[PDB]
């Protein structure tokens, strides 16, 4: 074999401890760049003028943050959607002031994570598996796209991208609520059903399989030793688990087909999270949550508040206080 | 910054005490007969 052939054989090899693959050829460098920049920035980056108003926000540990307050801060509103690579700055000091690390990190990450998804397809193919794990990963991936790319596009700035940090994340959430009433949007509601339900069904599946494990061990050892990696025989009694669950509710509400069960376990969280992602991606173009502000009126025309109006008061609080020096005109239009 | 001056020792022991516990249990497992 020639060099290219040998190289291709290595890249696509099923015997590498970690699969590389063609997706991996892009994933590995982009993820390493994003990671290294993030780590250094999170530790040592100076303050960043997120809102383009010469009001720099400190995100790094060395500049007075802890793990909870810290962040890599979004690029400046002055930049908007412009591409701000290192080489468009006059110096690294300028690059840093303007939030250049954010763009480098999110662009390398989104490319790398997209290739992580491709790589899941690729290895499934090399190993003779069915191909759709990558489709389940499209749900968190789409969500990362929504908050780091689609929302900025809609609003016209990477300054409105989710910050890379814990408190930064909460800031993004509170301002999103003020601006889009996300809680009242059915796609975020589906998202909640997706993750609360994913958690519920996770606990339920775990508990039911654990309930029905076949006795293979004694009281002074972990029941886990009753299963051996690669054994042919199933390790729990699905008939007993179904016998249980079908009586807990009623018979036809319980799955007696493992394939159907495991498909439901995939589909419920994945579909819900796809709607979560689509919620963010469509509120990106300001189709917002349901607005029932003053929807209930009495015979005279007096407003009779509902819980929607109370939400509205909270939202107003968020709206009027956020980015307190950035607005000069009465309406926040993006 | 004016941090709590017991945060360092609190954090160090929070890590070290249970980590030590686990390392002791692991190593004595390995040294048992195969």
């Amino acid at each position: 074999a020639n060099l290219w052939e040998r190289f291709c054989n290595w890249v696509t090899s099923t015997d590498n401890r970690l699969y590389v693959g063609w997706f991996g050829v892009i994933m590995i460098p982009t993820l390493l760049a994003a990671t290294i920049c993030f780590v250094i920035a999170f530790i040592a980056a100076p303050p960043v003028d997120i809102d383009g108003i010469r009001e720099p926000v400190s995100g790094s540990l060395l500049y007075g943050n802890n793990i909870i307050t810290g962040a890599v801060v979004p690029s400046s509103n002055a930049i908007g959607l412009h591409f701000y690579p290192i080489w468009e700055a006059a110096s690294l000091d300028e690059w840093l002031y303007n939030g250049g690390p954010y763009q480098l990190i999110i662009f390398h990450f989104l490319l790398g994570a997209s290739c992580y998804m491709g790589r899941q397809w690729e290895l499934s193919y090399r190993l003779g598996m069915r191909p759709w794990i990558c489709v389940a990963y499209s749900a968190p991936l789409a969500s990362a796209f929504a908050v780091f790319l689609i929302y900025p596009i809609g609003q016209g700035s990477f300054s409105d991208g989710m910050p890379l940090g814990i408190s930064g994340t909460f800031n993004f959430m509170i301002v999103f609520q003020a601006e889009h009433n996300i809680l009242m949007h059915p796609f975020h509601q589906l998202g909640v059903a997706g993750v609360f339900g994913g958690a519920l069904f996770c606990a339920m599946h775990g508990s039911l399989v654990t309930s029905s494990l076949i006795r293979e061990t004694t009281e002074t050892e972990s029941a886990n030793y009753g299963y051996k990696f690669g054994q042919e025989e199933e390790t729990y009694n699905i008939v007993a688990a179904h016998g249980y669950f079908g009586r807990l509710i009623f018979q036809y509400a319980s799955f007696n087909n493992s394939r159907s069960l495991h498909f439901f376990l995939a589909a419920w969280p994945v579909v819900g999270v796809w709607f979560a992602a689509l919620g963010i991606s469509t509120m990106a173009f300001n189709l917002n949550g349901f607005n029932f502000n003053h929807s209930v009126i009495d015979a005279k025309g007096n407003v009779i508040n509902t819980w929607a109006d109370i939400i509205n008061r909270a939202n107003l609080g968020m709206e009027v206080m956020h980015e307190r020096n950035a607005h000069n005109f009465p309406l926040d239009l993006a | 910054m004016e941090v709590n001056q017991l945060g360092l020792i609190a954090t160090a022991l929070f890590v070290l005490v249970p980590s030590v516990f686990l390392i002791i249990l692991y190593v004595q497992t390995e040294s048992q007969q195969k």
Partner: peptide
């Protein structure tokens, strides 16, 4: 001291990832 402590914990986590991956108990079939 605070910064050192955060970075130290993170770096221990990263080392752990390395050992958990490359120095795992290998899975063995029966």
């Amino acid at each position: 001291m605070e910064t050192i402590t955060y970075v130290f914990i993170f770096a221990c986590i990263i080392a752990l990832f390395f050992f958990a991956i490359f120095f795992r108990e290998p899975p063995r079939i029966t």
